[PDB]
Design a protein around this motif. Structure first.
Motif, mmCIF file in Angstrom:
data_model
loop_
_atom_site.group_PDB
_atom_site.id
_atom_site.type_symbol
_atom_site.label_atom_id
_atom_site.label_comp_id
_atom_site.label_asym_id
_atom_site.label_seq_id
_atom_site.Cartn_x
_atom_site.Cartn_y
_atom_site.Cartn_z
ATOM 1 N N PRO A 1 26.753 40.800 -40.778
ATOM 2 C CA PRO A 1 25.811 41.695 -40.243
ATOM 3 C C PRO A 1 25.153 41.999 -42.014
ATOM 4 C CG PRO A 1 27.533 42.514 -39.056
ATOM 5 C CD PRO A 1 27.930 41.104 -39.569
ATOM 6 N N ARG A 2 25.384 41.368 -43.134
ATOM 7 C CA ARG A 2 25.223 41.451 -44.468
ATOM 8 C C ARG A 2 25.605 40.065 -44.888
ATOM 9 N NH1 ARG A 2 23.434 45.318 -44.023
ATOM 10 N NH2 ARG A 2 24.050 48.109 -44.155
ATOM 11 N N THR A 41 42.715 33.618 -40.528
ATOM 12 C CA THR A 41 42.058 35.200 -39.653
ATOM 13 C C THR A 41 43.017 35.667 -40.537
ATOM 14 O OG1 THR A 41 41.548 33.784 -37.202
ATOM 15 C CG2 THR A 41 43.206 36.041 -37.154
ATOM 16 N N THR A 44 41.886 36.304 -44.068
ATOM 17 C CA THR A 44 39.896 36.724 -44.165
ATOM 18 C C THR A 44 39.852 37.368 -42.886
ATOM 19 O OG1 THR A 44 39.761 35.009 -44.822
ATOM 20 C CG2 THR A 44 38.242 36.538 -45.221
ATOM 21 N N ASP A 45 39.734 38.305 -42.711
ATOM 22 C CA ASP A 45 39.771 39.256 -41.592
ATOM 23 C C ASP A 45 37.614 39.190 -40.911
ATOM 24 O OD1 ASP A 45 42.583 39.475 -41.246
ATOM 25 O OD2 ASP A 45 42.706 41.591 -41.721
ATOM 26 N N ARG A 46 37.420 38.290 -41.772
ATOM 27 C CA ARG A 46 36.023 37.952 -41.583
ATOM 28 C C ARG A 46 35.694 37.289 -41.775
ATOM 29 N NH1 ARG A 46 30.493 40.443 -43.129
ATOM 30 N NH2 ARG A 46 31.185 41.303 -45.418
ATOM 31 N N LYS A 47 35.760 36.144 -41.487
ATOM 32 C CA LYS A 47 35.228 34.827 -41.839
ATOM 33 C C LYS A 47 33.625 35.067 -42.144
ATOM 34 C CE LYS A 47 36.865 31.026 -40.101
ATOM 35 N NZ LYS A 47 37.061 29.240 -39.440
ATOM 36 N N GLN A 53 28.425 32.344 -36.899
ATOM 37 C CA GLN A 53 29.663 32.665 -35.716
ATOM 38 C C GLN A 53 29.371 30.988 -35.165
ATOM 39 O OE1 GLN A 53 28.886 36.249 -34.533
ATOM 40 N NE2 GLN A 53 30.518 37.190 -36.171
ATOM 41 N N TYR A 59 32.160 26.865 -38.379
ATOM 42 C CA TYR A 59 31.375 27.810 -38.933
ATOM 43 C C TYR A 59 30.758 26.878 -39.639
ATOM 44 C CZ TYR A 59 34.254 32.019 -37.083
ATOM 45 O OH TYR A 59 34.442 32.313 -35.850
ATOM 46 N N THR A 241 33.871 40.912 -52.562
ATOM 47 C CA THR A 241 34.464 42.630 -52.146
ATOM 48 C C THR A 241 33.294 42.070 -50.208
ATOM 49 O OG1 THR A 241 32.240 42.751 -53.792
ATOM 50 C CG2 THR A 241 34.411 43.808 -53.586
ATOM 51 N N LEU A 242 32.545 41.212 -50.191
ATOM 52 C CA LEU A 242 32.027 41.274 -48.817
ATOM 53 C C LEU A 242 32.924 40.359 -48.719
ATOM 54 C CD1 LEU A 242 28.625 42.135 -47.996
ATOM 55 C CD2 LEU A 242 28.718 39.912 -48.137
ATOM 56 N N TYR A 244 35.772 39.763 -48.547
ATOM 57 C CA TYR A 244 36.877 40.049 -47.903
ATOM 58 C C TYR A 244 36.773 41.769 -48.022
ATOM 59 C CZ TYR A 244 39.938 36.177 -48.805
ATOM 60 O OH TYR A 244 39.691 34.411 -48.824
ATOM 61 N N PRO A 245 37.062 42.554 -47.086
ATOM 62 C CA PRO A 245 36.718 44.234 -47.102
ATOM 63 C C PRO A 245 37.754 44.764 -48.173
ATOM 64 C CG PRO A 245 37.621 43.449 -45.469
ATOM 65 C CD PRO A 245 37.980 42.008 -46.351
ATOM 66 N N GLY A 246 36.485 45.854 -49.162
ATOM 67 C CA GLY A 246 36.450 46.724 -50.457
ATOM 68 C C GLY A 246 36.792 47.682 -49.985
ATOM 69 N N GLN B 25 40.006 48.911 -44.480
ATOM 70 C CA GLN B 25 38.433 48.446 -43.980
ATOM 71 C C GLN B 25 37.502 48.508 -43.957
ATOM 72 O OE1 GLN B 25 39.756 46.008 -40.898
ATOM 73 N NE2 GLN B 25 39.818 43.804 -41.950
ATOM 74 N N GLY B 26 36.753 48.508 -44.870
ATOM 75 C CA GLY B 26 35.214 49.308 -44.400
ATOM 76 C C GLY B 26 34.097 48.792 -44.305
ATOM 77 N N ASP B 27 34.330 46.772 -44.220
ATOM 78 C CA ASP B 27 32.995 45.880 -43.226
ATOM 79 C C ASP B 27 33.155 46.349 -42.029
ATOM 80 O OD1 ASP B 27 33.520 43.542 -45.831
ATOM 81 O OD2 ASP B 27 32.904 45.402 -46.188
ATOM 82 N N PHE B 28 34.428 46.966 -41.977
ATOM 83 C CA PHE B 28 34.479 46.946 -40.473
ATOM 84 C C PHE B 28 33.353 48.081 -39.453
ATOM 85 C CE2 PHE B 28 38.367 44.593 -38.020
ATOM 86 C CZ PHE B 28 38.655 43.939 -38.652
ATOM 87 N N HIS B 31 29.271 47.675 -40.642
ATOM 88 C CA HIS B 31 28.731 47.801 -39.623
ATOM 89 C C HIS B 31 28.801 48.365 -38.349
ATOM 90 C CE1 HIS B 31 28.613 43.704 -42.425
ATOM 91 N NE2 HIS B 31 29.503 43.387 -41.996
ATOM 92 N N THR B 63 31.808 42.802 -36.231
ATOM 93 C CA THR B 63 32.059 41.851 -37.541
ATOM 94 C C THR B 63 33.265 41.190 -37.000
ATOM 95 O OG1 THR B 63 33.379 43.984 -39.102
ATOM 96 C CG2 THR B 63 34.148 43.621 -37.125
ATOM 97 N N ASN B 64 34.298 41.089 -35.613
ATOM 98 C CA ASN B 64 34.521 39.983 -36.468
ATOM 99 C C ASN B 64 34.588 38.375 -35.477
ATOM 100 O OD1 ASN B 64 37.039 42.775 -35.575
ATOM 101 N ND2 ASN B 64 37.089 41.420 -37.532
ATOM 102 N N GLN B 66 37.433 36.537 -34.190
ATOM 103 C CA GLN B 66 38.838 35.499 -34.477
ATOM 104 C C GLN B 66 39.699 36.543 -34.596
ATOM 105 O OE1 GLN B 66 36.665 36.984 -37.251
ATOM 106 N NE2 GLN B 66 38.725 37.822 -38.004
#
Lengths: 436, 121, 83, 436
Positions: A1-2, A41, A44-47, A53, A59, A241-242, A244-246, B25-28, B31, B63-64, B66
């Motif tokens: 969403p970025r 997974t 990275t917790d946001r591929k 998607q 991907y 930093t996008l 992976y989470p910053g 985790q700020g991205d979660f 979002h 935001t996921n 997976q």
């Protein structure tokens, strides 16, 4: 969403973005034909970040690769990273146009593929949840990429109102003037669109690149092929930093916000230290994190040429130091103490500056999680050295009787040439004016 | 330490409450707060709660794609406070790592009252 | 039988009040009659006695943890009257 | 006991009901002249709801088949589905008429065979005490089904308005214009009777099928005969809580009750997603309930044309979303939370609306009961685009002046032509006024 759509453009500009995606496939643990690794997974917790998607359990890049010659895109289908790219969803097959050369050639040629160039990037932002913006991955070298690359700076600035525009401008070898000679012209034409229609840019040069290409690689043949490896690395390093989470400034519209005081002062200097086969083996015996952000303020890892005496005629205002991989975090806040101790970068007395330190996790693959990499994304007011460098080669060229009649048969029948000289001298004074 | 490893995953939730409620985790959470931002700008109501409950669920699928398989998302919920209408409506919304089981032997009521205070800053 | 007293009384009264909305419609040439408009006026009261009675349930539904599955169901049919 | 009498009528109108009944025997798991297994009654817990109730062990249709051409039913006389019908009762074999290619041919044959046309459908209602209604399985296509069908829309409306009247209006093919040329004329006369002497219509556009037939089936040129396949499946799809016993809206006047707020705003757009046969090799591993009813808010599942730029200028009032087969029933209440939250449609905010989700079991034959099916039966207020589309084709014909005395030699000796332009702007404005 970025999510960001890369606008890879030019003869050289598709090649420098090519290895950017090949770099991403190795850290996301994907193959260019499916998903294979389970490190994808857990690491990275946001591929999704520059990927749509899945619709085939694979991907999909958000990449477009357009160029005047079809030769550069035929130089990608012989690689099987063109099965990561789809034939008409990412590159368009047989993208035609000029030969091409001169900036005014490719600038009028987007006006007749005006419908179609915006139907492959509006046809991918049509899935996107909320689009951040556009990064225009184009080249100033040649007239193909610089001509058309300047047109997407206009049309995305009157059909998109709050979207990020930013280009990785690669200025050609300045010592060469027999490779291209329309170079002071196509550079200053683009420099005018970046100070009244772009937000922020990432400056790069080749003569300062080759300063590192003969010191850390020690190859004595400069070419387009050895210079795309240095370029793709800082592209992926700048947005981890996008990826992976910053925490704080976890957006790209976070990082860039604090790297800019006013427009026409947004030209950011990049530095990237590790390019040696000795650095991989000296991080196993520990290398410290208290000196990988004191070595970036040594000017010989920078890809933008500037004085050794213009570094105390200009004050730093924002400097960002993103270290990745190994990072010792009970003393990383202690490493940021020691910058003020050396005073190798000055800071503005009348306003408050910033020594920004940041960190981010890498690939969960070990020889790319244990090596020290120090990325600098600076904002120094000594960026005027390249503007004087292009601008003295511009007034010099028109007094050598060139492009006063060789540039006035490409739909240009008016003076607009001293509009480029005067508008560069306003930008160059206002960069310096912002410090006291 | 072996009966927790089979049933409760106790020392993982020691890490999991740090990733959301303190935003590791700020991205979660960005979002989340993104979609949530036109909804918090208005004065609070009593018709407020029904869409805060699904703006979480719309956030952890957005935001996921997976990391929905874990039971971490189901063991965190949305906590609401009865805030009067005069205010922006931002100091209303808060998250909490919902526990009430024998997993609440390292969590207690004096704990999540202090998680409520670190959540606002 | 949603919660013992309150909520259960709001609901069976709801279906009683639109069972009289049936007997309001079951007139043939109903609205052009004096009693057609006379009967109408009583029911538009009996209805806002229910929209307000349902509304007191929503404050308690906002109030935290009455029965969550009761509040998710009763708000779902309500956002389903809206969207 | 909601026994429905079908009025299959017209050249094309027999063809769309022909496979409707042939599907129903396939789903009852029985041969077309007998009952051949015990899986028919244990699997299907109510088979009769259009059919004549059993007393010979075989269920027989309640069908009437009228056409001006006896040739479509003689291509049925020697076809082995003449024991699922009757050739002396159900269909009259050798039923004369004209070609027909006039609205006034068929309108005047129903005005001298007026006693017999209403004494062939009350001899098909003598197995139920309390009748559901009549479903007009007829077409606005050609002059046969459209010429005669407007007579039945009035006389079954003044002898039976209490009962359901509902038509599946299959619009004239607009790529024909040299085979049928009375097309704007016969379409607006039958539509005028549909806005005050009918309860519901179900709008179906033919040119919008052939848009989907080349994107999800990919046949080289979709021809009429492969267009009747796409209708008959969606017909059996709308009855799935009426046939197999539901518990909520188990009468047909149950479903239609919350999909019609007010007369002349009852025109339902139909959508059906499992036309793509690449939904089936993915629902064999399950395709989620979390995306099978988000694709019924996708503006490309539609079999009918409507505006797209009139989807932000208008709002949905009632949309029913039937998912079928496998559903996982405990996360279907989780999916309906998630429709409103992205905002995949607009919906009116001033008053009553409804996003209705329903679920149903299918055939005891697993190779058609393990593949997700999504039926949309929409009511969106941008349907006034179709009435403009037909009207721009009407006034353009009256401006070349045809059918202004070439149409007033049979049963018209008045001028009701500007009554049809007028009745259409009446319709378009009363639909547009209702929301705000």
């Amino acid at each position: 969403p970025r999510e960001i759509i890369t606008l890879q453009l030019g003869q050289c500009g598709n090649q420098i973005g090519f290895e950017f995606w090949k770099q991403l496939c190795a850290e996301h643990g994907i193959s260019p034909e499916g998903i294979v690794e389970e490190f994808a997974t857990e690491g990275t917790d946001r591929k999704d970040v520059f990927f749509y998607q899945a619709d085939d359990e694979h991907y999909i890049p958000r990449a477009v690769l357009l160029d005047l010659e079809p030769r550069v895109i035929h130089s990608i289908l012989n690689s099987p990273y063109a099965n990561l790219y789809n034939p008409e969803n990412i590159y368009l097959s047989e993208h035609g146009g000029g030969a091409g050369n001169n900036w005014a050639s490719g600038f009028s040629q987007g006006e007749k593929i005006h419908e179609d160039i915006f139907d492959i990037i509006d046809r991918e932002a049509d899935g996107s949840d909320s689009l951040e913006g556009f990064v225009l991955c184009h080249s100033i070298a040649g007239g193909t990429g610089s001509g058309l690359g300047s047109y997407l700076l206009e049309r995305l600035n009157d059909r998109y109102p709050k979207k990020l525009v930013q280009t990785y401008s690669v200025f050609p070898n300045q010592d060469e003037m027999s490779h291209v000679v329309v170079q002071p012209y196509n550079s200053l034409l683009t420099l005018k669109r970046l100070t009244q229609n772009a937000d922020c840019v990432v400056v790069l040069d080749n003569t300062a690149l080759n300063r590192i290409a003969t010191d850390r690689l020690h190859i004595q043949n400069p070419s387009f092929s050895q210079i795309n490896q240095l370029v793709s690395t800082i592209m992926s390093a700048s947005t981890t930093t996008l990826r992976y989470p910053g925490y704080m400034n976890n957006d790209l519209i976070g990082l860039i916000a604090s790297l800019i005081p006013t427009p026409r002062l947004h030209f950011l200097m990049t530095g990237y230290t590790p390019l040696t086969t000795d650095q991989s083996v000296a991080s196993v015996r520990k290398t410290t994190v208290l000196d990988v952000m004191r070595r970036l303020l040594q000017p010989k890892n920078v890809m933008v040429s500037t004085g050794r005496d213009r570094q105390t005629n200009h004050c730093y205002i924002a400097i960002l130091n993103i270290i990745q991989g190994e990072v010792d975090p009970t003393q990383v806040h202690k490493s940021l103490q020691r910058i003020r101790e050396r005073k190798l970068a000055n800071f503005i007395p009348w306003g408050p500056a910033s020594i920004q330190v940041a960190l981010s996790r890498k690939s969960p693959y070990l020889p790319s999680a244990h090596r020290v990499s120090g990325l600098m994304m600076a904002n120094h007011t000594n960026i005027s050295s390249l503007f004087e460098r292009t601008c003295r080669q511009y007034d010099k060229l028109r007094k050598r009787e060139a492009f006063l009649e060789q540039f006035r048969k490409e739909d240009i029948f008016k003076d607009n040439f001293d509009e480029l000289d005067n508008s560069r001298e306003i930008v160059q004074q206002l960069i310096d004016e912002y410090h006291a | 330490l072996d009966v927790l490893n089979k049933n409760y995953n106790l020392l993982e939730h020691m890490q999991a409450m740090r990733r959301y409620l303190l935003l590791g985790q700020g991205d979660f959470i960005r979002h989340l707060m993104d979609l949530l931002k036109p909804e918090l700008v208005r004065p609070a109501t009593t018709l407020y709660q029904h869409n805060l409950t699904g703006i979480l669920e719309t956030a952890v699928r957005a935001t996921n794609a997976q990391f929905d398989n874990p039971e971490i998302l189901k063991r965190l919920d949305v906590r609401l406070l009865e805030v009067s209408p005069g205010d922006t409506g931002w100091d209303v919304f808060s998250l909490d790592y919902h526990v009430d089981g024998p997993i609440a032997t390292v969590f207690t009521r004096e704990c999540m009252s202090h998680y409520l205070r670190v959540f606002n800053f | 039988f949603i919660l013992l007293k309150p909520v259960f009384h709001c609901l069976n009264e709801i279906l009683e009040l639109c069972h009289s909305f049936c007997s309001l419609v079951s007139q043939n040439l109903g609205p052009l009659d004096e009693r057609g408009a006379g009967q109408l006026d009583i029911l538009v009261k009996g209805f806002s006695c229910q929209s307000s009675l349902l509304f007191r349930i929503l404050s308690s539904v906002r109030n935290h943890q009455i029965n969550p599955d009761l509040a998710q169901l009763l708000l779902r049919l309500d956002y389903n009257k809206y969207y």
